[PDB]
Amino acid sequence: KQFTKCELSQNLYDIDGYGRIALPELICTMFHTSGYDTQAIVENDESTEYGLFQISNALWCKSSQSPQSRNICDITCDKFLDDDITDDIMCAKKILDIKGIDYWIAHKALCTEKLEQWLCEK
């Protein structure tokens, strides 16, 4: 499932100021990250990143591809490919708590200027 900008900001409302992050900032980031597609799958070196949040199996979830993964979010990477982004969000919170938003390269890159384009309400 692909989200529209507003449908997502909607579902992620209670994330604003979460860890001193700005919603628009985070929306901007997801856009460049997966284009808001829940089924986004990206193979990197050996490893892969999954879902809207493109959370890596090198460290965050468990995949047969990287048995040695620390599986910090303690979940199978397959859970990041369904139409329920709840679990995804819990993993995302975990990343934010431990790593920070710089886990996502698009942040520093393009989402710290004109986050205007990233607001919705109507």
- Contact call for residue 37 and Ca ion (CB under 5 A): no
- Ranges of beta strands (E only) in 44-110 are 48-50, 55-56
From the list 93, 82, 71, the residue with the least C-alpha distance to 41 is 82
| Count of positions on this chain that bind Ca ion (CB under 5 A) | 5
CB 21 within 8 A of CB 30: no
CB of 45 to Ca ion, least distance (A): 24
- Contact call for residue 88 and Ca ion (CB under 5 A): yes
- Contact call for residue 97 and Ca ion (CB under 5 A): no
- Tokens 């985070």, located at residue: 26
Separation between Cα atoms, residue 71 and residue 61, nearest integer Å: 4
Nearer to Ca ion, 55 or 59 (CB): 55
Q: Give the residue ranges of the annotated binding site for Ca(2+).
A: 79, 82, 84, 87-88
- Contact call for residue 82 and Ca ion (CB under 5 A): yes
Query: Given candidates 7, 16, 78, 84, which one binds Ca ion under the rule CB under 5 A?
Result: 84
